Amino acid sequence: GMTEYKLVVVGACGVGKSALTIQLIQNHFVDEYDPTIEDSYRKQVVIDGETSLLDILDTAGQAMRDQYMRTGEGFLLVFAINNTKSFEDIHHYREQIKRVKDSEDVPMVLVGNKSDLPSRTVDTKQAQDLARSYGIPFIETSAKTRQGVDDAFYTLVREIRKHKE
Ligand SMILES: *CCC(=O)N1CC(NC(=O)Cn2c(C3CC3)c(C(=O)N3CCc4c(cccc4OC)C3)c3cc(Cl)cc(C)c32)C1
Ligand SMILES: Nc1nc2c(ncn2[C@@H]2O[C@H](COP(=O)(O)OP(=O)(O)O)[C@@H](O)[C@H]2O)c(=O)[nH]1
Ligand SMILES: [Ca+2]
Ligand SMILES: [Ca+2]
């Protein structure tokens, strides 16, 4: 009966939801993943000395969403730093989560993915400011280089712990 955390990764098509999830678990960068595959992925982690099982839903669908959202304990809000629309979508993802959870206090982390890319359309400042207003952590990640990937998920677990403690 080990501690489990139900995590849900959300965000627009092509932001790197699958790449982040697979990097975390497999330590491998998928250069392309079938965008129709929605599945749960398991990971055993130790975070600040506490061992736990992560049950991570990598969302892809475009019914049972309400249920995974309802049972989800923490949400990774992923955008890509070279996709302004994906950043604008964040607001709506957050709103839907609050709506179905019927709670203003839901563990979430804002993730700006593709930090390895030489060009970007979303400033760090913009993302930092948004996260500041939401009162949630902001992490820049690269599923390719692995920069910040562990930290993004670990930070989400720490937010879930705070919420429960
Ligand atoms: C290319 C395949 C892929 O990765 N994806 C992600 C995208 N699928 C979803 O976003 C499914 N979805 C929705 C559906 C309307 C799109 C919602 C939702 O109800 N939102 C509220 C309205 C809204 C959202 C995002 C952008 C713009 C919006 O309206 C202006 C979000 C979802 C909420 C969550 Cl928490 C998760 C998911 C998967 C989701 C195809
Ligand atoms: N350069 C770079 N490419 C990435 C990164 N993360 C994902 N990608 C690529 O962007 C595309 C979309 O990634 P994917 O995980 O399928 O996005 P999803 O639709 O959100 O699940 C794929 O070609 C990935 O290889 C990243 O951190 N850096
Ligand atoms: Ca995907
Ligand atoms: Ca907060």
From Swiss-Prot:
Reactions performed catalytically: GTP + H2O = GDP + phosphate + H(+)
Effect seen on changing residue 35 to R: In CFC2; characterized by a defective GTPase-activating protein sensitivity and a strongly reduced interaction with effectors
Effect listed in the UniProt record for changing residue 61 to R: In CFC2; characterized by a defective GTPase-activating protein sensitivity and a strongly reduced interaction with effectors
Predominant localisation class: membrane
Residues recorded as bearing N-acetylmethionine in the entry: 2
Record keywords: Acetylation, Cardiomyopathy, Cell membrane, Cytoplasm, Deafness, Disease variant, Ectodermal dysplasia, Glycoprotein, GTP-binding, Hydrolase, Intellectual disability, Isopeptide bond, Lipoprotein, Membrane, Methylation, Nucleotide-binding, Palmitate, Prenylation, Proto-oncogene, Ubl conjugation
Positions of modified residues (N6-acetyllysine): 101
Compartment list: Cell membrane; Endomembrane system; Cytoplasm, Cytosol
UniProt record, GO biological process: actin cytoskeleton organization; cardiac muscle cell proliferation; cytokine-mediated signaling pathway; epithelial tube branching involved in lung morphogenesis; female pregnancy; forebrain astrocyte development; gene expression; glial cell proliferation
Pfam families associated with the record: Ras
SUPFAM superfamilies: P-loop containing nucleoside triphosphate hydrolases
Phenotypic consequence of residue 15 to I: In NS3; affects activity and impairs responsiveness to GTPase activating proteins; characterized by a strong increase of both intrinsic and guanine nucleotide exchanged factor-catalyzed nucleotide exchange leading to an increased level of the activated state
Record-listed N-acetylthreonine modification sites: 3
Molecular function as annotated in GO: G protein activity; GDP binding; GMP binding; GTP binding; GTPase activity; identical protein binding; LRR domain binding; protein-containing complex binding
Effect of residue 62 to L: Promotes GTP binding
Effect of mutating residue 62 to H: In lung carcinoma
Entries under InterPro entries matching the protein: P-loop_NTPase, Small_GTP-bd, Small_GTPase, Small_GTPase_Ras-type
Chain segments annotated as transmembrane: none
Subunit-structure text: Interacts with PHLPP. Interacts (active GTP-bound form preferentially) with RGS14. Interacts (when farnesylated) with PDE6D; this promotes dissociation from the cell membrane. Interacts with SOS1. Interacts (when farnesylated) with GPR31. Interacts with RAP1GDS1. Interacts (active GTP-bound form) with both SHOC2 and PP1c (all isoforms) to form a tertiary complex; SHOC2 and PP1c preferably bind M-Ras/MRAS, but they also bind K-Ras/KRAS, N-Ras/NRAS and H-Ras/HRAS. Interacts (GTP-bound form) with MAPKAP1/SIN1; inhibiting K-Ras/KRAS activity.
Purpose of the protein: Ras proteins bind GDP/GTP and possess intrinsic GTPase activity. Plays an important role in the regulation of cell proliferation. Plays a role in promoting oncogenic events by inducing transcriptional silencing of tumor suppressor genes (TSGs) in colorectal cancer (CRC) cells in a ZNF304-dependent manner.
UniProt similarity note: Belongs to the small GTPase superfamily. Ras family.
Disorder: Leukemia, acute myelogenous: A subtype of acute leukemia, a cancer of the white blood cells. AML is a malignant disease of bone marrow characterized by maturational arrest of hematopoietic precursors at an early stage of development. Clonal expansion of myeloid blasts occurs in bone marrow, blood, and other tissue. Myelogenous leukemias develop from changes in cells that normally produce neutrophils, basophils, eosinophils and monocytes. Leukemia, juvenile myelomonocytic: An aggressive pediatric myelodysplastic syndrome/myeloproliferative disorder characterized by malignant transformation in the hematopoietic stem cell compartment with proliferation of differentiated progeny. Patients have splenomegaly, enlarged lymph nodes, rashes, and hemorrhages.
Record protein name field: GTPase KRas
Taxonomic source organism: Homo sapiens (Human)
